[PDB]
Design a binder for this molecule. Sequence first.
Ligand code: AP1
Ligand code: AP1
Lengths: 107, 107
Amino acid sequence: GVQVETISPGDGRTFPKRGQTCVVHYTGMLEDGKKVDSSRDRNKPFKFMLGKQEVIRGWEEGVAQMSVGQRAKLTISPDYAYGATGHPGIIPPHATLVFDVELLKLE
Amino acid sequence: GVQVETISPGDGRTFPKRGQTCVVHYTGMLEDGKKVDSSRDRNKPFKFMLGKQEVIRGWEEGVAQMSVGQRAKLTISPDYAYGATGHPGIIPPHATLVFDVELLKLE
Ligand SMILES: CC[C@H](C(=O)N1CCCC[C@H]1C(=O)O[C@H](CCc1ccc(OC)c(OC)c1)c1cccc(OCC(=O)O)c1)c1cc(OC)c(OC)c(OC)c1
Ligand SMILES: CC[C@H](C(=O)N1CCCC[C@H]1C(=O)O[C@H](CCc1ccc(OC)c(OC)c1)c1cccc(OCC(=O)O)c1)c1cc(OC)c(OC)c(OC)c1
């Protein structure tokens, strides 16, 4: 599943609802700490809409548990991410992924 | 993931909303056709509430795509069911499950 470790607290009351656009900055890494991708390296935050199947399962479930302003480490098992196949050149097979995620705002 | 094959049509309009109780009769079986369990063998239909994590993943997603009266066969991969461990005595490890499900009503 997805495990959540809080790094910095959010407001503790404003949580994302399906249909809302989540604006976040993230760093995705393999279990051994190696960086695969990061929005912080790109000039603009990442955005997705909750409930539209726009992202891997672990993210839908994990980010829905965060409040605005919160920063957390989400540890996602393969079955909740890219599973057996992974994704060529980016994610190896059966990979557990760890994301450092910061929920900036909802829109 | 979860694949849905329709066996008998439903009303094509009444679909389960998160928070509603789905009343169904089902027969679950392994990929080779052996029956593991069936509510049709038990005197009353199976009931569960959508969106409350009461059932395996594949069911939350598959039943949500059925309308009242529909009968369908849901083929669920391990990652959407019991994964690598299975469930002692009932579901073996790495089991793909096939369910014959009939959505009787919503309440
Ligand atoms: C740590 C690397 C990272 C990743 O893992 N991230 C991205 C951040 C959200 C969580 C997760 C993801 O979910 O990234 C998805 C990957 C594809 C995907 C999508 C839905 C799935 O299922 C319902 C699924 O099933 C496995 C796989 C994603 C990507 C881009 C925009 C996205 O949002 C909407 C859009 O703008 O198109 C979504 C990643 C970034 C990519 O580009 C920034 C990317 O592209 C090259 C990619 O391909 C594997 C990986
Ligand atoms: C084909 C065998 C079958 C099964 O597979 N079925 C049952 C029908 C819904 C789909 C699925 C299920 O999901 O069955 C779950 C199993 C447990 C479970 C639950 C949530 C999970 O969350 C992701 C999860 O993760 C793996 C595992 C279930 C069971 C009973 C009531 C249930 O809910 C209503 C209630 O609480 O009364 C749920 C099964 C029947 C059982 O009893 C009738 C049972 O018990 C002995 C069982 O244990 C493995 C198997």
